[PDB]
Design a protein around this nucleic acid. Structure first.
Ligand SMILES: [Mn+2]
Ligand SMILES: [Mn+2]
Ligand code: NA
Length: 95
RNA sequence: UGGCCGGCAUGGUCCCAGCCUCCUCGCUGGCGCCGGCUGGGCAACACCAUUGCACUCCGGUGGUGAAUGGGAC
């Protein structure tokens, strides 16, 4: 069951050996060109490792980042991007 | 030694280089041998498991079962 467009893009299949701080840094490095980023959430917990939530200010950016970077080799692995099932709080607190 | 103990071996204090380690990374730490008990912590490192949709920090296990020489007194 696919997901509907969202301000936030959910990414997984990310190299799990990368420290949280760097992963956010590097993600920002390759995603900032698609639009203003409000935040990037990463957690190395058993359940949230290898995944990340890039929160774009404008949905169009999210869509671009999704179409263009899908499959992109990052830290030796192909990035698998989707739209986040639900809105991130940062977005809720506005729209 | 992370904390504690037993057997044995072993002249001494320094100085230079090298090497070692999860538990005060280095020169007012350590670098003979053998055996047993034992606590903390995943922070780093490694290994195992994990493809997982969050906005609550939170998987497990392992390491010391470690590291040599040189020189002045
Ligand atoms: Mn030590
Ligand atoms: Mn030894
Ligand atoms: Na861990």
């Amino acid at each position: 069951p696919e997901t509907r467009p969202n301000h936030t893009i959910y990414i997984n299949n990310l190299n799990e050996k990368i420290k949280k701080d760097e992963l956010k840094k590097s993600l920002h490095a390759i995603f900032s060109r698609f639009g203003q980023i409000l935040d990037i959430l990463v957690s190395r917990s058993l359940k949230m490792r290898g995944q990340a939530f890039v929160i774009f200010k404008e949905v169009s950016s999210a869509t671009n980042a999704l179409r263009s970077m899908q499959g992109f080799p990052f830290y030796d692995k192909p990035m698998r991007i989707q739209y986040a099932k639900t809105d991130s709080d940062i977005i809720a607190k506005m729209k």
